[PDB]
């Protein structure tokens, strides 16, 4: 969980 | 008085996390009205449209985002995700591979997200 998913808004 | 583009992108982001996807997409559209040269407003709205199954709208937004920022990793990823849900497998894989290259070039770390998506893109293609 240390990286934010790419399936998310900026 | 009025919301700024930054306020509206912020509202849309909170609405997105709230699973209020049509409401989020409208907020991003209002941000675009206030500044139509921000690629991120379009890739954000593209991802709302993906969640809403409006793939054709999502495609359009990704294409507009690429005119504004040709390097956008998420523009390529969401484009590949969209073409994947539309049974357009070779185009999806190309775009996911391009997101992977751009992310490496830009030192972005989404963990295994892009390799995983590529594996599913190729698996779904093989199963079809």
Author numbering:
A (entry chain E): 633 to 642
B (entry chain B): 23 to 150
What did the original publication write about this model?
To explore these questions, we focus on a cleaved proteoform of tau (tauC3), which selectively accumulates in AD and was recently shown to be degraded by its direct binding to the E3 ubiquitin ligase, CHIP.
A 1.8 Å crystal structure of the CHIP TPR domain bound to a 10-mer tauC3 C-terminal peptide. Critically, this co-structure also suggested why phosphorylation of S416 weakens binding to CHIP. Specifically, we noted that tauC3’s Ser416 was in close proximity with CHIP’s Asp134. Thus, phosphorylation of tauC3’s S416 would be expected to create interference at this site, likely involving both steric and electrostatic clashes. To test this idea, we mutated CHIP’s Asp134 (D134A) or the adjacent Phe131 residue (F131A), to alanine and tested binding of these CHIP variants to tauC3 peptides. Fortunately, installing D134A into CHIP was tolerated; for example, it bound normally to WT tauC3 in DSF experiments. To independently verify this finding, we performed FP assays and confirmed that CHIP D134A bound normally to WT tauC3 (Ki 5.57 ± 0.34 µM) and that it regained the ability to bind phosphorylated tauC3 peptide (Ki 1.84 ± 0.23 µM).
